[PDB]
Write a protein that holds these residues in place. Structure first.
Motif, PDB file in Angstrom:
ATOM      1  N   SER A 267      14.036  13.253  -3.752  1.00  0.00           N
ATOM      2  CA  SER A 267      13.244  14.461  -3.688  1.00  0.00           C
ATOM      3  C   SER A 267      14.058  15.704  -3.936  1.00  0.00           C
ATOM      4  O   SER A 267      13.494  16.723  -4.340  1.00  0.00           O
ATOM      5  CB  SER A 267      12.597  14.589  -2.309  1.00  0.00           C
ATOM      6  OG  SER A 267      13.594  14.844  -1.339  1.00  0.00           O
ATOM      7  N   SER A 268      15.357  15.657  -3.677  1.00  0.00           N
ATOM      8  CA  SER A 268      16.226  16.754  -4.019  1.00  0.00           C
ATOM      9  C   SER A 268      17.618  16.184  -4.186  1.00  0.00           C
ATOM     10  O   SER A 268      17.984  15.265  -3.445  1.00  0.00           O
ATOM     11  CB  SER A 268      16.226  17.832  -2.945  1.00  0.00           C
ATOM     12  OG  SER A 268      17.125  18.868  -3.286  1.00  0.00           O
ATOM     13  N   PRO A 269      18.406  16.683  -5.105  1.00  0.00           N
ATOM     14  CA  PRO A 269      19.721  16.091  -5.317  1.00  0.00           C
ATOM     15  C   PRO A 269      20.652  16.449  -4.184  1.00  0.00           C
ATOM     16  O   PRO A 269      21.378  17.446  -4.238  1.00  0.00           O
ATOM     17  CB  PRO A 269      20.160  16.699  -6.644  1.00  0.00           C
ATOM     18  CG  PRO A 269      19.498  17.971  -6.653  1.00  0.00           C
ATOM     19  CD  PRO A 269      18.176  17.786  -6.042  1.00  0.00           C
ATOM     20  N   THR A 270      20.589  15.652  -3.130  1.00  0.00           N
ATOM     21  CA  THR A 270      21.319  15.911  -1.906  1.00  0.00           C
ATOM     22  C   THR A 270      22.597  15.087  -1.868  1.00  0.00           C
ATOM     23  O   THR A 270      22.632  13.946  -2.340  1.00  0.00           O
ATOM     24  CB  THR A 270      20.446  15.583  -0.706  1.00  0.00           C
ATOM     25  OG1 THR A 270      19.231  16.336  -0.788  1.00  0.00           O
ATOM     26  CG2 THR A 270      21.145  15.922   0.568  1.00  0.00           C
ATOM     27  N   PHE A 271      23.635  15.681  -1.304  1.00  0.00           N
ATOM     28  CA  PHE A 271      24.909  15.044  -1.049  1.00  0.00           C
ATOM     29  C   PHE A 271      25.148  14.975   0.450  1.00  0.00           C
ATOM     30  O   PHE A 271      24.268  15.291   1.258  1.00  0.00           O
ATOM     31  CB  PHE A 271      26.019  15.816  -1.743  1.00  0.00           C
ATOM     32  CG  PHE A 271      25.941  15.766  -3.209  1.00  0.00           C
ATOM     33  CD1 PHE A 271      26.323  14.635  -3.873  1.00  0.00           C
ATOM     34  CD2 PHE A 271      25.524  16.853  -3.928  1.00  0.00           C
ATOM     35  CE1 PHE A 271      26.271  14.578  -5.225  1.00  0.00           C
ATOM     36  CE2 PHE A 271      25.469  16.799  -5.288  1.00  0.00           C
ATOM     37  CZ  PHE A 271      25.844  15.652  -5.938  1.00  0.00           C
ATOM     38  N   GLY A 272      26.344  14.548   0.821  1.00  0.00           N
ATOM     39  CA  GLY A 272      26.761  14.634   2.200  1.00  0.00           C
ATOM     40  C   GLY A 272      28.261  14.725   2.366  1.00  0.00           C
ATOM     41  O   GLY A 272      28.968  15.231   1.487  1.00  0.00           O
ATOM     42  N   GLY A 273      28.760  14.211   3.483  1.00  0.00           N
ATOM     43  CA  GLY A 273      30.133  14.435   3.870  1.00  0.00           C
ATOM     44  C   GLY A 273      31.163  13.724   3.033  1.00  0.00           C
ATOM     45  O   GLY A 273      32.362  13.921   3.257  1.00  0.00           O
ATOM     46  N   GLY A 274      30.747  12.903   2.082  1.00  0.00           N
ATOM     47  CA  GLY A 274      31.700  12.197   1.264  1.00  0.00           C
ATOM     48  C   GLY A 274      32.516  11.186   2.025  1.00  0.00           C
ATOM     49  O   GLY A 274      32.402  11.065   3.248  1.00  0.00           O
ATOM     50  N   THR A 275      33.335  10.435   1.296  1.00  0.00           N
ATOM     51  CA  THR A 275      34.071   9.314   1.861  1.00  0.00           C
ATOM     52  C   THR A 275      35.423   9.212   1.188  1.00  0.00           C
ATOM     53  O   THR A 275      35.502   8.886   0.000  1.00  0.00           O
ATOM     54  CB  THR A 275      33.309   8.020   1.662  1.00  0.00           C
ATOM     55  OG1 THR A 275      33.094   7.838   0.258  1.00  0.00           O
ATOM     56  CG2 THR A 275      31.987   8.080   2.367  1.00  0.00           C
ATOM     57  N   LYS A 276      36.473   9.463   1.949  1.00  0.00           N
ATOM     58  CA  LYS A 276      37.830   9.466   1.440  1.00  0.00           C
ATOM     59  C   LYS A 276      38.466   8.099   1.638  1.00  0.00           C
ATOM     60  O   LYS A 276      38.045   7.306   2.483  1.00  0.00           O
ATOM     61  CB  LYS A 276      38.654  10.543   2.142  1.00  0.00           C
ATOM     62  CG  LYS A 276      40.056  10.716   1.606  1.00  0.00           C
ATOM     63  CD  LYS A 276      40.768  11.869   2.260  1.00  0.00           C
ATOM     64  CE  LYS A 276      42.186  11.994   1.736  1.00  0.00           C
ATOM     65  NZ  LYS A 276      42.952  13.096   2.386  1.00  0.00           N
ATOM     66  N   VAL A 277      39.488   7.832   0.837  1.00  0.00           N
ATOM     67  CA  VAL A 277      40.207   6.572   0.875  1.00  0.00           C
ATOM     68  C   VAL A 277      41.698   6.854   0.885  1.00  0.00           C
ATOM     69  O   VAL A 277      42.168   7.829   0.293  1.00  0.00           O
ATOM     70  CB  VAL A 277      39.838   5.690  -0.323  1.00  0.00           C
ATOM     71  CG1 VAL A 277      40.617   4.406  -0.258  1.00  0.00           C
ATOM     72  CG2 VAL A 277      38.363   5.438  -0.311  1.00  0.00           C
ATOM     73  N   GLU A 278      42.445   5.987   1.554  1.00  0.00           N
ATOM     74  CA  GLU A 278      43.895   6.070   1.518  1.00  0.00           C
ATOM     75  C   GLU A 278      44.475   4.718   1.905  1.00  0.00           C
ATOM     76  O   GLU A 278      43.764   3.712   2.003  1.00  0.00           O
ATOM     77  CB  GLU A 278      44.402   7.182   2.442  1.00  0.00           C
ATOM     78  CG  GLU A 278      44.176   6.927   3.923  1.00  0.00           C
ATOM     79  CD  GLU A 278      44.666   8.070   4.785  1.00  0.00           C
ATOM     80  OE1 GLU A 278      45.170   9.067   4.228  1.00  0.00           O
ATOM     81  OE2 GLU A 278      44.556   7.967   6.023  1.00  0.00           O
ATOM     82  N   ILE A 279      45.783   4.711   2.121  1.00  0.00           N
ATOM     83  CA  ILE A 279      46.531   3.579   2.635  1.00  0.00           C
ATOM     84  C   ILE A 279      47.028   3.970   4.017  1.00  0.00           C
ATOM     85  O   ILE A 279      47.060   5.158   4.356  1.00  0.00           O
ATOM     86  CB  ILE A 279      47.699   3.226   1.687  1.00  0.00           C
ATOM     87  CG1 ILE A 279      47.162   2.867   0.294  1.00  0.00           C
ATOM     88  CG2 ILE A 279      48.553   2.086   2.257  1.00  0.00           C
ATOM     89  CD1 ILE A 279      48.218   2.871  -0.793  1.00  0.00           C
ATOM     90  N   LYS A 280      47.342   2.967   4.837  1.00  0.00           N
ATOM     91  CA  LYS A 280      48.091   3.148   6.082  1.00  0.00           C
ATOM     92  C   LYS A 280      49.192   4.196   5.973  1.00  0.00           C
ATOM     93  O   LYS A 280      49.418   4.973   6.902  1.00  0.00           O
ATOM     94  CB  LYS A 280      48.708   1.816   6.500  1.00  0.00           C
ATOM     95  CG  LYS A 280      49.433   1.837   7.864  1.00  0.00           C
ATOM     96  CD  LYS A 280      50.923   2.268   7.885  1.00  0.00           C
ATOM     97  CE  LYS A 280      51.827   1.372   7.069  1.00  0.00           C
ATOM     98  NZ  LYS A 280      51.855   0.017   7.656  1.00  0.00           N
TER      99      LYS A 280
END
Ligand SMILES: *[C@@H]1O[C@H](CO)[C@@H](O[C@@H]2O[C@H](CO)[C@@H](O[C@@H]3O[C@H](CO[C@H]4O[C@H](CO)[C@@H](O)[C@H](O)[C@@H]4O)[C@@H](O)[C@H](O[C@H]4O[C@H](CO)[C@@H](O)[C@H](O)[C@@H]4O[C@H]4O[C@H](CO)[C@@H](O)[C@H](O)[C@@H]4O)[C@@H]3O)[C@H](O)[C@H]2NC(C)=O)[C@H](O)[C@H]1NC(C)=O
Ligand SMILES: *[C@@H]1O[C@H](CO)[C@@H](O[C@@H]2O[C@H](CO)[C@@H](O[C@@H]3O[C@H](CO[C@H]4O[C@H](CO)[C@@H](O)[C@H](O)[C@@H]4O)[C@@H](O)[C@H](O[C@H]4O[C@H](CO)[C@@H](O)[C@H](O)[C@@H]4O[C@H]4O[C@H](CO)[C@@H](O)[C@H](O)[C@@H]4O)[C@@H]3O)[C@H](O)[C@H]2NC(C)=O)[C@H](O)[C@H]1NC(C)=O
Ligand SMILES: *[C@@H]1O[C@H](CO)[C@@H](O[C@@H]2O[C@H](CO)[C@@H](O[C@@H]3O[C@H](CO[C@H]4O[C@H](CO)[C@@H](O)[C@H](O)[C@@H]4O)[C@@H](O)[C@H](O[C@H]4O[C@H](CO)[C@@H](O)[C@H](O)[C@@H]4O[C@H]4O[C@H](CO)[C@@H](O)[C@H](O)[C@@H]4O)[C@@H]3O)[C@H](O)[C@H]2NC(C)=O)[C@H](O)[C@H]1NC(C)=O
Ligand SMILES: *[C@@H]1O[C@H](CO)[C@@H](O[C@@H]2O[C@H](CO)[C@@H](O)[C@H](O)[C@H]2NC(C)=O)[C@H](O)[C@H]1NC(C)=O
Ligand SMILES: *[C@@H]1O[C@H](CO)[C@@H](O[C@@H]2O[C@H](CO)[C@@H](O)[C@H](O)[C@H]2NC(C)=O)[C@H](O)[C@H]1NC(C)=O
Ligand SMILES: *[C@@H]1O[C@H](CO)[C@@H](O[C@@H]2O[C@H](CO)[C@@H](O)[C@H](O)[C@H]2NC(C)=O)[C@H](O)[C@H]1NC(C)=O
Ligand SMILES: *[C@@H]1O[C@H](CO)[C@@H](O)[C@H](O)[C@H]1NC(C)=O
Ligand SMILES: *[C@@H]1O[C@H](CO)[C@@H](O)[C@H](O)[C@H]1NC(C)=O
Ligand SMILES: *[C@@H]1O[C@H](CO)[C@@H](O)[C@H](O)[C@H]1NC(C)=O
Ligand SMILES: *[C@@H]1O[C@H](CO)[C@@H](O)[C@H](O)[C@H]1NC(C)=O
Ligand SMILES: *[C@@H]1O[C@H](CO)[C@@H](O)[C@H](O)[C@H]1NC(C)=O
Ligand SMILES: *[C@@H]1O[C@H](CO)[C@@H](O)[C@H](O)[C@H]1NC(C)=O
Lengths: 89, 213, 121, 106, 89, 213, 89, 213, 121, 106, 121, 106
Positions: free
Chosen positions: J93-106
């Protein structure tokens, strides 16, 4: 042909606004005693030309109704008005 | 496209599209109106049989409907309740909203039968069938109406511009050179009809044989 | 009684223009409609255009739509026809013609004007 | 959109004979046809309305009929005056004419 | 994508007024032989952009119909016209 | 709000609200028109099964209807007469006025059954179902139509801008990855269908097995 | 009399156009979750005069509906607009 | 003729015909709107019996219908399913398109009987019966609604301007000084009603005798 | 092939204004739509506004409605964006973005411009 | 009007592992969801359309699914390139995003 | 509390004109409507015209339609009436009158102004 | 369009008596009638709304009724103050009056 220069008609009181409270349905008349019944004795050939005019108008009228899918047209006069506007603006 | 009539100086003119008016301001729409008119004004033979001759039947064409705001009194209204002689209906019912022609003087109500070859009942010249503030291309089953036409008009910004007899009949053929007719006074007493007979004459005969049975 | 008066003839160059005037008398000029038909020499007929009995409705043939402009005058018991941009094909005898029926129906014609053998060069 | 077909193209026949002329079309039509006459120079004249309704001031010899597409025009007992050229005017959907029909003697 | 630059359509003769007496119903055709059948071979990408335009228009169109209670709309173009009038007047 | 297209110098532009025109006088409304268009122009796979895949069912939503004045010829019309396999109707009747798509080339008429989970039959992408001068959000029972869309347009003040084959089918599942299909030649002779098969190919097969029974 | 100066309403999102793909029916809601639910706390006597205005308007409104044959009117505001145009042009 | 309201500088004025505006350009129509309003704002006795007193029946008059675009929340919706005590229906069915008032808080659904002398159910003062985005002169059989009125308005070019409880009843007389009433909790358990009792009080009594049976 | 060209960056004072221009090449610029999304530093995304493939339909987020004016030019294979009255919150990287689908549907975006870290002071 | 919920907020994991990410919403949605990637400075990239339709030129390791509100994104056999930040774009209904999702290693 | 103030009387020639002003106080001047009724000497009553509680709706008797123009001013707690083209019949006592009901219904009148015996010569 | 009929024209009666007055019309009307009083010079006063709803600050002696066309006004136990002239105001379809009704003593 024959033509009745006299005329007697049955208009509605769409306005005129000679109104008390009988405008309400529940206390109002059913469907009658509501149409004003006005008479006319003006120019004689006027109405003969008028009847003529309607008889002529019939043609394009049928073509119009033929040329849609609507059952119950109600949108003519508005269309004519806006046409006149464009024709002037 | 369509014509339209005007009232300038209390008389008539005509204009389709191109004729200007720098005069008629067209102050509003309540002056703009649409009007029906009966053919009695033209003074045709308003007997019963010619009606059947002035009409017909066919199919493949729909009905159409339109609105007008005012018309004319009727010296001859007409209603019909007809079936095919097999027993089936000729006509379709009158849909909702539609009602009989309100303002009559001589209701020539009828029943009868005949081959209604065509699921709708048009006028022959392409007239209308004038119900309460409404016209049709056709007739509806069991409803008063009148024959007439329509015009559209403008007015200037100055002003604006009862018994309802019943009559009954019977008939057959009904769209034929063999069409028959009868007039009712009683359960049993009828008569072979003629185009001569007016509503007034037959109304008078509601005294003669009304006495003589 | 019915007395049509087809105007005389005039030469006009190609692309030119002209205003015809047919007049009538013998009846109610308003109650009936009129039209125009042409016959080039050694040819048949061809409807041109037509008018209501009062001037509201106009009707034109496809071949000349926009090129020709019909008109009348009820008051003067007079017909007209304005025309322009004229080609060679338009060379013909234009007749003012009256209907059999009344009140802008019955295109089939009762009477016939004298005709005018219009030309282009 | 509709087109007619006069037939025959003409005739070369003599007085007293009876003649019919046909007139066809590309599409079906009711009794909404007409007929005319005119001579080499004369303004024309009307003959029938609706395909059978004779006009005023015309001999009763003039008669025709038909329906749909086929339409006729039968005249017995010809005359010199009858040897004009005749035409067939559609007026169903557009006032259409066609090739006309000429008359003469041998 | 695919796109037919050619086009062939079925308009009505709402006017054109090439009319005799067949305008009457009782002697007229039923529902057919009434729609003019016009062809087209004009600019090719024109109609591709046109088809595109309709496919885009669909969205607001559905929203509009969704956004009323009418069944059989007929009042669009009149509304657009009067909107244009206001937009100019 | 809504878009609208224009024809200036015989080519196209676009304007929602704010783009003026001090040029297009908009002389009248007959030039103002509304037009349907079939998706065959876009050239999708116009076989029978993808139709079922291009569609769906649900409920809680009404139908809606709209008017256009002209459209396009149909290389693939479609009509349906379907019941739920219990025996009840899937579809609602076509109301009055509405009629089949008038101008067809290959009428892919069908019957069959399947779980019609949803009292109405929408298009999946939100297309239309194009009847005589009319569109819908849905399909109606037992009526020809076509798939397509609509645009609205202005024109300038210059001008304006047949066999109808029958074809029959049977099928089940009908909104499923289990949907089946069959093609008719006779009372009894049918065949398992493929998306390959065109109207022309099957029309040809009205000769092959028409001979071989 | 009594009058609630506060107001809470249920408009439609005829536009606003905060739209993704849910405009499509088949994937859209049925009839609900579609009407915006806006609140109001503006001038108090404003809405009292407003309620008054509607109660007054009722009269001519009934006369109008009485004065036609239409069942389902939809043509009012267009008529008012064109009336205003004429009243200015 | 008809009134019309305006919003100039975020406040109200009024004008029928003649009051100019050289200010309100009337940029478009989406700002032009039509609005319903409930009478709860006026603060009448919104009990059950006065409703019956606020209404009536007659015949000879049709129904009429109109469109508005927005209204107000309902603290008291109403639905009816009533028959004449002989067994026949009082009310006509609700035609297509029409649906219950969408946005309720206390649905005072009812059944019962009584002499429905009049084939339609008008309001007494001449109010409306507010369905989904629609009003009527009358009530329809078996459909939620609300009482209210309408106004028409212009706006400037800046901006735009949930549980649904069920409740049930029984009653007789129904348009009478002898009208009776009852309130439901169970199949059998009812109570003689009073105008005092609010939805909240009766909702509370869905605990008291809900415990005490 | 798909070659977006995000314009460079400029400083503008609060309340100011700006006209962005993203250009594209590698396909039919008209057949697809475009939009704008922003990412302030250390933040997620936020849709701004969008356009039809031809410029009829516009769509704006609520937060910036009226403040921003989208536009394109099919002829020049060019996007634009006019903006004004600017607050500090608008400081972000504005990207010109292309759809996956075609013909002004499929808001979900295929490509991504380079971005421009617009600033206010 | 609708809001998303990426979950988990991020991850610190190593190559070869398999990972799923969730993405919820406040309202039911069909298969009209997408996924993306981008790195600290890079312009983003598309991954899936409709919540399952993989894009061109992408490893097949990328996969997700769901319906209604719950939506997933499962990737086995990670890579260094896979350690961008990822996002979840509503487009119902609307091009909504959010908090996103980050990636890394130990 | 309800304190009508009927203006004084003035002589005007035939065909002339006049603006009446009745004022009121004691209630919400806007919530109620007003009207005008006349009584010539040795005569009964006759309704003239009336207004909504806010000025939208007007209502006039047939006998004086167009001749008379009602108006009010909610802000000033004031009524008016403009009139013209006056005949001898108009000689009478014009009263400003208030309704019983509220909100432009209930033509039946509660209060009555003092009256003003308007004259023509 | 509608017309009333006060009846009797007047009365010449004395204190303590009871009197009824009639008021007819040309067309049927509900309980939408009123009554008034005024004296030779005095501004009038309202008496009843709807044909039976008495006004505030009025003696209860004042009473009337009716329906359709026939309508009444009965008062017992008269007074000097009661000897004003009285009137009958239609307000069904137009605020119509009529000939009024005067009172006096022998
Ligand atoms: C606008 O207003 C005008 C009037 O100003 C009105 O024109 C009227 O049209 C009707 C319809 O044609 C005219 O009536 C015709 O009259 C002729 C001649 O009348 C005499 O003869 C008839 C029959 O013998 C007598 O009844 C009459 O009393 C006169 O003595 C008739 O011959 C016509 O009948 C035939 O044609 C009609 C048109 O189809 C048919 O209705 C009728 O059934 C006849 O057709 C039958 O016979 C044909 C023979 O070939 C056959 O081919 C057909 O298939 C069919 O079997 C017709 O009755 C009337 O005179 C006109 N009025 C004037 C003043 O001229 C317009 O109708 C009106 N416009 C509209 C839309 O209403
Ligand atoms: C305006 O005009 C444009 C064209 O210019 C038109 O766009 C077209 O939209 C349709 C609808 O998406 C597109 O068709 C899609 O094609 C993809 C990929 O195509 C390949 O793969 C499919 C399937 O394997 C093959 O059949 C095809 O031949 C190709 O090989 C399909 O994957 C899409 O199918 C899925 O999505 C559709 C959208 O919901 C569904 O209809 C379909 O059932 C599939 O969804 C199913 O699977 C999903 C998997 O996750 C699942 O989540 C769903 O719930 C469901 O089960 C689709 O068929 C077409 O390509 C577009 N055309 C172009 C040129 O791009 C617009 O539709 C048009 N506007 C309007 C209003 O009509
Ligand atoms: C616009 O907004 C206004 C409000 O601002 C609103 O006005 C309201 O109108 C109603 C309808 O008249 C008013 O209610 C009337 O109240 C009087 C007096 O109230 C007291 O007395 C009654 C009855 O004893 C008590 O119930 C009440 O609680 C008070 O104590 C009532 O007497 C009226 O009832 C009679 O008249 C009504 C109108 O016909 C009938 O509905 C009712 O049945 C009664 O008539 C019956 O008895 C008559 C006796 O002669 C008989 O002749 C009849 O035939 C019938 O049998 C009525 O209930 C309310 O007070 C007004 N509000 C204000 C603030 O004044 C408008 O209605 C609104 N416009 C629209 C279109 O809705
Ligand atoms: C013919 O006239 C008789 C009376 O002379 C009509 O019969 C009367 O009809 C009216 C209403 O139609 C009744 O009120 C009378 O009681 C009837 N009187 C008698 C003696 O029967 C009769 O209806 C007329 N014929 C037609 C067809 O209307
Ligand atoms: C397949 O072709 C046959 C003829 O080759 C069709 O049968 C003919 O149908 C027409 C009208 O549809 C009839 O007028 C002929 O009389 C039929 N001929 C025979 C020999 O039956 C048949 O209809 C075609 N199949 C389909 C599905 O239309
Ligand atoms: C009165 O309250 C009871 C519960 O206290 C209602 O019964 C519940 O109704 C809901 C849905 O209406 C069901 O989901 C529950 O399972 C019911 N619980 C029990 C124990 O029956 C009851 O509906 C209320 N009364 C009315 C008229 O609504
Ligand atoms: C109007 O017509 C009448 C006669 O019909 C004439 O005396 C008068 O001068 C005309 N007035 C105008 C303004 O045309
Ligand atoms: C015959 O007429 C009488 C009245 O005179 C009526 O009661 C009866 O119902 C009629 N019967 C039929 C069959 O019309
Ligand atoms: C219209 O376009 C043609 C080519 O498409 C061009 O030659 C002509 O000059 C144009 N005229 C106008 C007025 O734009
Ligand atoms: C089978 O086909 C024949 C014509 O070949 C037809 O007469 C018959 O009605 C058909 N039966 C069914 C059940 O379709
Ligand atoms: C609008 O009204 C406000 C107060 O309501 C006032 O301060 C302001 O000056 C007004 N502006 C105009 C343009 O009328
Ligand atoms: C009575 O109530 C029960 C639920 O408590 C329900 O199952 C049953 O159908 C009801 N019966 C009637 C006649 O209302």
């Amino acid at each position: 042909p024959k033509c009745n220069p006299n005329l007697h008609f049955w208009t509605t009181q769409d306005e005129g606004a000679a109104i008390g409270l009988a405008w309400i349905p529940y206390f109002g008349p059913a469907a009658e005693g509501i149409y004003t019944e006005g008479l006319m004795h003006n120019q004689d050939g006027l109405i003969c030309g008028l009847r003529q005019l309607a008889n002529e108008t019939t043609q394009a009228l049928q073509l119009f109704l033929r040329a849609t899918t609507e059952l119950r047209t109600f949108s003519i006069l508005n269309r004519k008005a806006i046409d006149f506007l464009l024709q002037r603006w | 496209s369509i014509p339209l009539g005007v009232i300038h100086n209390s008389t008539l003119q005509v204009s389709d599209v191109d004729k200007l008016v720098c005069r008629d301001k067209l102050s509003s729409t309540n002056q703009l109106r649409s009007v029906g008119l009966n053919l009695e004004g033209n003074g045709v033979a308003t007997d019963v049989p010619s009606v059947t001759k002035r009409w017909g039947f066919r199919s493949g064409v729909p009905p159409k409907v339109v609105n007008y705001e005012a018309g004319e009194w009727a010296e001859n209204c007409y209603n019909l309740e007809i079936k095919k002689p097999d027993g089936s209906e000729c006509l379709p019912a009158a849909p909702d909203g539609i009602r009989g022609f309100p303002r009559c003087r001589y209701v020539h109500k009828v029943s009868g039968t005949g081959p209604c070859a065509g699921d709708f009942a048009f006028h022959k010249e392409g007239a209308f069938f004038l119900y309460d503030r409404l016209a049709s291309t056709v007739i509806y089953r069991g409803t008063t109406f009148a024959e007439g036409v329509v015009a559209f008009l403008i007015l200037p910004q100055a002003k604006k511009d009862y018994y309802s007899t019943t009559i009954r009949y019977q008939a057959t053929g009904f769209g034929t050179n063999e069409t028959e007719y009868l007039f009712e006074v009683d359960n049993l007493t009828y008569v072979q009809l003629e185009s001569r007979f007016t509503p007034q004459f037959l109304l008078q005969l509601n005294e003669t044989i009304y006495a003589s049975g | 009684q019915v007395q049509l008066v087809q105007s005389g003839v005039t030469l006009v160059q190609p692309g030119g223009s002209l205003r015809v005037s047919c007049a009538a008398s013998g009846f109610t000029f308003s109650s009936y409609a009129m039209s125009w038909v042409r016959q080039a020499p050694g040819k048949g007929l061809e409807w041109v255009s037509a008018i209501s009995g009062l001037g509201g409705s106009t009707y034109y043939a496809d071949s000349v739509k926009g090129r020709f402009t019909i008109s009348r005058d009820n008051s003067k018991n007079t017909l007209y026809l304005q025309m322009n941009s004229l080609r060679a094909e338009d060379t013909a005898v234009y007749y003012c013609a009256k209907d059999h029926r009344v009140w802008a129906a019955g295109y089939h014609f009762d009477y016939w004007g004298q005709g005018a053998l219009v030309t282009v060069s | 959109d509709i087109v007619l077909t006069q037939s025959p193209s003409t005739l070369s026949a003599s007085v007293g004979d009876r003649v019919t002329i046909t007139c066809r079309a590309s599409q079906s039509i009711s009794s909404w046809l007409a007929w005319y006459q005119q001579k080499p120079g004369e303004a024309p004249k009307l003959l029938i309305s609706d395909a059978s309704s004779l006009e005023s001031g015309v001999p009763s010899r003039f008669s025709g009929s038909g329906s749909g597409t086929e339409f006729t025009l039968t005249i017995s007992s010809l005359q010199p005056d009858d040897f004009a050229t005749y035409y067939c005017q559609q007026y169903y959907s557009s006032p259409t004419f066609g090739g006309g029909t000429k008359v003469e003697i041998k």
